[PDB]
């Protein structure tokens, strides 16, 4: 079939891509720059697909084939093609190259591709045996570059276990395997492992256990954008549950900003799900441009009816939505947070009153927030004032909630401080740009 | 100076946003007249930023030393 003929052409091109990866993989090993591998690993997701049984076999029959037990491990785990007419022997290793054991980078990369194919073939156990052996191979392997290729495999290995749906067997493994990186000052591997570990933690709701891990651990600042985006969501999820709302918004909005423009329709879907609920509990009505966007249109529409409820403050409407769309929230892992809101709808209206009125008499606050009595609002009016949702002072001598007299900020020191955080980053960007500058060793 | 640097950014946008690739290495050598790209660029940034930093630091030192 011409589809497979293009497939083998895709195979050879993927082999050429792999050969490009392996040649670059073998490039970095002798190129003295782990950066090269990152390019091959970013093509990994792209080359992750577009492969069937003939691909790996010819790759493993093209790569490796040193008569090493490696062939004996993944060849049986993947269906072998017949005596195909186009037997393009794709051996980047010729003789001595075959005789030389495959570098830990390419072998895992090829094995990961098998692992990926194992995932692509749903063979998480053969991959399990493949992968842990991969790890059992790379567990001993202590190179500096393999840490990268190991990091990708880890999430896939976490992902193979991810489809295995245990996540506790790897809870310890990923928990210890992490410590191997940190004792190596390795950058990427520590980043990737932590995100997979945390996902493990939230998946069973051990927020207490998770909240600790972020407390002591330090996420490498010079981390992959992809990872930095992930860690920010998980921390945002933890912070939101821990009742540290204000920080939950700052990280989640920052986590969202780091999403890979338009590749991950999902991640943006879930984060917006928490951001909208996270924002509501803090007293801020979320952005409307969200709910109209294409990808998040139907996904967040369930939350849409909510945010309309809070602004309306019609508790009967709010309960009605939880009754209907509430059950769906649980799967999203948000029902609990919404339950907080049901007894927190009064805050925003307290903010709306403080944002527009500046000296509203308490009795008036009760009228405009549906509070039962003028006395009841006082605790709520102060509480919102107490909790820093307002900036007002309740003069109980005559029952009026005065708002703070706003000042000319430009004559105070706020603008200078805002410029400092800005200039420090701007200067740092110059140093980071200049600092690397990667002048290749003049050829 | 900020006004003069602004006009120099306009060219910087035009000079870069052009990014014409008809032998760009030759483009970078057929348009050398001590012009927009950098020489009249941050060259002013150093002057502008040196003048302010020194002035500001003098301002704060005096605020401390003299009462």
């Amino acid at each position: 079939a011409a589809a497979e003929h293009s497939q083998r052409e895709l195979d050879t091109v993927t082999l050429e891509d792999i050969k490009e990866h392996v040649k670059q993989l073998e490039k970095a090993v002798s190129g003295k720059e782990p950066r090269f591998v990152l390019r091959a690993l970013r093509m990994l997701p792209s080359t992750s697909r577009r492969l069937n049984h003939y691909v790996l076999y010819k790759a493993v029959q093209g790569f490796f084939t040193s008569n090493n037990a490696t062939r004996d491990f993944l060849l049986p785990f993947l269906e072998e093609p017949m005596d195909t007419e186009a037997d393009l022997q794709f051996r980047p290793r010729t003789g001595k190259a075959a005789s030389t054991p495959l570098l830990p980078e390419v072998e895992a990369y090829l094995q990961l591709l098998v692992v990926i194919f194992m995932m692509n073939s749903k063979r998480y156990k053969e991959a399990q045996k493949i992968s842990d052996d991969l790890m059992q191979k790379i567990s001993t392997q202590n190179r500096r570059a393999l840490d990268l290729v190991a990091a990708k495999c880890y999430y896939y290995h976490a992902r193979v276990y991810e489809f295995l749906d245990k996540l506790d067997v790897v809870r310890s493994f990923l928990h210890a395997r992490l410590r191997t990186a940190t004792l190596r000052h390795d950058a990427d591997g520590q980043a990737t492992l932590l995100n997979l570990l945390l996902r493990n933690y939230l998946h069973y709701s051990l927020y207490d256990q998770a909240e600790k891990l972020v407390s002591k651990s330090v996420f490498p600042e010079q981390a992959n954008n992809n990872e930095w985006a992930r860690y920010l969501y998980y921390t945002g999820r933890i912070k939101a549950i821990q009742l540290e709302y204000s920080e939950a918004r700052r990280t989640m909005t920052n986590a969202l900003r780091k999403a890979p423009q338009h590749t991950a329709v999902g991640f943006k879907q879930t984060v917006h799900k928490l951001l909208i609920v996270v924002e509501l509990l803090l007293g801020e009505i979320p952005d409307r441009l969200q709910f109209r966007q294409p990808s998040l249109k139907r996904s967040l529409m369930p939350y849409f009816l909510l945010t309309q409820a809070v602004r309306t403050g019609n508790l009967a409407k709010f309960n009605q939505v939880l009754d209907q769309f509430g059950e769906k929230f649980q799967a999203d892992g948000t029902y609990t947070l919404i339950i907080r809101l049901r007894h927190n709808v009064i805050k925003t209206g307290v903010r709306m009153i403080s944002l527009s009125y500046s000296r509203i008499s308490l009795a008036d606050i009760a009228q405009k927030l549906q509070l039962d009595s003028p006395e009841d609002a006082e605790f709520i009016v102060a509480k919102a004032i107490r909790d820093g949702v307002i900036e007002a002072s309740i003069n109980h001598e005559k029952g009026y909630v005065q708002s703070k007299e706003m000042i000319d900020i430009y004559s105070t020191r706020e603008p200078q401080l805002a410029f400092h955080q800005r200039i420090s980053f701007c200067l740092d960007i110059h140093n980071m740009s200049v600092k690397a500058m990667r002048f290749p060793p003049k050829s | 100076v900020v006004k003069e640097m602004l006009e120099l950014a306009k060219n910087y946008n035009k000079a870069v946003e052009e990014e014409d690739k008809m032998t760009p290495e030759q483009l970078a050598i057929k348009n050398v007249g001590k012009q927009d790209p950098k020489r009249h660029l941050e060259e002013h940034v150093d002057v502008l930023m040196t003048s302010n930093i020194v002035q500001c630091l003098a301002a704060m030192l005096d605020t401390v030393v003299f009462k």
């Binding site: 110059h430 740009s433 200049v434 050829s443 | 940034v45």
Partner: peptide, 30 residues
């Protein structure tokens, strides 16, 4: 701050121009 930003965008532009320079020469070597 405006001085700082200009010096930063110029810095990044100079790394992108340089990243292209060594990469392009990298491929062109083959």
């Amino acid at each position: 701050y405006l001085a700082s930003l200009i010096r930063s965008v110029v810095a990044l532009h100079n790394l992108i121009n340089n990243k292209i320079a060594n990469r392009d020469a990298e491929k062109k070597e083959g």
